[PDB]
């Protein structure tokens, strides 16, 4: 075989400790670049003028941050959605002042994670598997896209993309609530149903299978040793687990079919999170949460507050305080 | 939720953070386990819709743990190899997360908050050019408190004249 | 109109309150809208000169129809709630408005997303069906069982 | 920055004490007859 043929065989080999594959051919360098730039920036990058008003925000550890406060800071509002690679800067110092690391990292990362999804398809194909694990992964991926790419596009600036840091994430959330009332948006509510529900069903399934483990061990050893990797027999009694849960609620609320059950386990959080992503991605174009501000009115016309109006007051606090030196005109239109 | 952000800085609390890790991690495990089982199924029927090819009474695993293990080993670097451990872990993550969040709220009962980082405040008080996302979020909190307290806490009879309300430029 | 010299008016941050430079030097509108300087529109272009917004044109050449149009567009920005309350998320009920641009953009993002998902679904399935394992793994011929261990 | 001076040793013992617990248990597990 010729060199290219050999190379292809290696790339797509099912015997590599970590599968490479063609998606991996793109994934590996982009994820490495994103990772390296991220670590160096998080430790050592100078303050970044996120909002384009010459008010640099310090993100890195060496410049006064800890793990909780630190971040790689989004690129300058002056850049907006312009492409700002290293070679567009007059110098690395300019590049750093304007938040170049952020763009390098999120673009390399979004590409790399997309290829990660593709790679999940690819290995499933090489191993003779069914292909849809990658579809499950599309949910967290879509969310990543929502906060790093789509929301910036809609608002016209990567300065509004989610910061790469813990406190920065919280900042993104609070400003988001101010400007979109995301809590009153049904797609975010479906997202909450997705992750609360995912947690519920995770615990539920975990506990039901654990409850019906077939006795294979003594009391002085871990029950886990009762399962051996690759054994053909199922390790728990699903009829007993179903007897239990079916009696816990009523019989027809419970799954007797393991395939049906596991499909449910996949579908609930995945769909919920799909809607969370779509929530962010559509509030990106300012179609916002329900607004029931002053919706209840008495016979004279006095406003009768509901809990929605209290929410509105909180949001007002966030709105009037955020980016306190950036607005010169009365409406925050992006 | 918004009250806890504004008054307790609850997102800053490591017990809440552990809570979040447990809920999102629980969701992740739910998703990945369901999808993995569904995509390592043995062909146990002729149907293209594969749900019917299962019998609750059957002895055999309905999906391949060995294939699942190799797939995730080659994709993520590590993989479950033990089913019992897998399901116990699925119990452990979200249950523990919720327990931790509980501990945090018990703290917030006494206003025993993770509200501030003292070093941050000392630096920022002395140095008017020092800014982080932590100081940004405190400004947001201060807005929430001032703008929500009078209607949210009517028994206090708060009257905050316009001139004392914290506000950035224009807004 | 009130007497301000908008060309020399320094804003709180040090950048122009009304006018500033883009990163390549063009004169552009100040404030947050610095992000939107790539915008071009029939009502704004007559104020544009070779170096961007022209201070002389701004001072002497702005027509009433331009004021009108700017006011109209400022007050019909594509922001609004799911129940069609126009304005920022904190606005009170009164104006029944969500921009068609918002409706169209959001609808087609949702549809494009689910169609990407559909593509992954049906592509993966088509691969598996063509290769013949879309219904699951053959127990007596499980591919991984014929592969050398990873370690 | 004016950090808490006990933070360093607090973090160091927080990591080392239980890590060392685990390493001890692991090594003596490996050394048991196979």
């Amino acid at each position: 075989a010729n060199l290219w043929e050999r190379f292809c065989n290696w790339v797509t080999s099912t015997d590599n400790r970590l599968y490479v594959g063609w998606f991996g051919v793109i994934m590996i360098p982009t994820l490495l670049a994103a990772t390296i730039c991220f670590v160096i920036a998080f430790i050592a990058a100078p303050p970044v003028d996120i909002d384009g008003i010459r008010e640099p925000v310090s993100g890195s550890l060496l410049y006064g941050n800890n793990i909780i406060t630190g971040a790689v800071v989004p690129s300058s509002n002056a850049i907006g959605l312009h492409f700002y690679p290293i070679w567009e800067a007059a110098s690395l110092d300019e590049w750093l002042y304007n938040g170049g690391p952020y763009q390098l990292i999120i673009f390399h990362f979004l590409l790399g994670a997309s290829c990660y999804m593709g790679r999940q398809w690819e290995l499933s194909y090489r191993l003779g598997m069914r292909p849809w694990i990658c579809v499950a992964y599309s949910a967290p991926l879509a969310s990543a896209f929502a906060v790093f790419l789509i929301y910036p596009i809609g608002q016209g600036s990567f300065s509004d993309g989610m910061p790469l840091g813990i406190s920065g994430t919280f900042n993104f959330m609070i400003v988001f609530q101010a400007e979109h009332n995301i809590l009153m948006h049904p797609f975010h509510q479906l997202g909450v149903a997705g992750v609360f529900g995912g947690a519920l069903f995770c615990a539920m399934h975990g506990s039901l299978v654990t409850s019906s483990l077939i006795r294979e061990t003594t009391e002085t050893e871990s029950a886990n040793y009762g399962y051996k990797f690759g054994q053909e027999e199922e390790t728990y009694n699903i009829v007993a687990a179903h007897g239990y849960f079916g009696r816990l609620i009523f019989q027809y609320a419970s799954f007797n079919n393991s395939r049906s059950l596991h499909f449910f386990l996949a579908a609930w959080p995945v769909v919920g999170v799909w809607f969370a992503a779509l929530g962010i991605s559509t509030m990106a174009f300012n179609l916002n949460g329900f607004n029931f501000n002053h919706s209840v009115i008495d016979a004279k016309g006095n406003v009768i507050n509901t809990w929605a109006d209290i929410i509105n007051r909180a949001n007002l606090g966030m709105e009037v305080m955020h980016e306190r030196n950036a607005h010169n005109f009365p409406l925050d239109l992006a | 939720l918004l009250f806890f952000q504004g008054f307790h800085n609850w997102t800053l609390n490591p017990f809440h953070m552990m809570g979040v890790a447990g809920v999102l991690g629980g969701a992740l495990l739910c998703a990945i386990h369901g999808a993995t089982v569904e995509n390592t199924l043995f062909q146990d029927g002729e149907g293209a819709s594969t749900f019917r090819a299962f019998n609750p009474t059957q002895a055999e695993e309905t999906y391949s743990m060995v294939t699942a293990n190799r797939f995730w080993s080659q994709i993520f670097g590590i993989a479950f190899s033990n089913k019992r451990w897998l399901h116990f872990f699925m119990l452990f993550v979200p249950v523990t997360g919720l327990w931790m969040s509980a501990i945090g709220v018990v703290g917030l009962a006494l206003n025993l908050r993770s509200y501030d980082f003292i070093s941050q405040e000392i630096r920022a008080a002395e140095d008017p050019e020092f800014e982080t996302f932590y100081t940004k979020n405190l400004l947001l909190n201060e807005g929430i408190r001032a703008w929500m307290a009078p209607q949210d806490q009517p028994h206090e009879n708060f009257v905050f004249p316009e001139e004392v309300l914290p506000r950035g430029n224009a807004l | 109109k009130l007497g301000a010299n908008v060309g020399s008016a320094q804003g709180p941050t040090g950048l122009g309150k009304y006018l500033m430079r883009s990163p390549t030097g063009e004169i552009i509108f100040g404030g947050e809208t610095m992000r939107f300087w790539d915008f071009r529109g029939p009502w704004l272009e007559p104020l544009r000169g070779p170096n961007g917004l022209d201070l002389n044109k701004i001072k002497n050449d702005i027509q009433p129809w331009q004021e009108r149009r700017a006011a109209e567009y400022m007050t019909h920005a594509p922001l609004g709630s799911l129940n069609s309350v126009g304005g920022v998320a904190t606005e009170i009920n009164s104006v029944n408005f969500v921009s068609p641009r918002s409706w169209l953009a959001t609808s087609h993002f949702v549809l494009a997303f689910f169609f990407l998902v559909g593509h992954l679904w049906h592509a993966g399935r088509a691969r598996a069906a063509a290769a013949g394992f879309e219904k699951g793994i053959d127990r007596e011929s499980e591919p991984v069982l014929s592969m050398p261990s990873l370690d | 920055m004016e950090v808490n001076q006990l933070g360093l040793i607090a973090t160091a013992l927080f990591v080392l004490v239980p890590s060392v617990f685990l390493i001890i248990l692991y090594v003596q597990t490996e050394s048991q007859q196979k």
């Binding site: 400790r17 | 670097g77 | - | 360093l8 990591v15």
Partner: peptide, 30 residues
Amino acid sequence: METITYVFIFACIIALFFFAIFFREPPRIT
């Protein structure tokens, strides 16, 4: 010292990734 501590814990975690992956106990079929 703070920075050194943060980066040290992070570094130990990466090292741990390496051992957990390439020096894991190999899964064995029974």
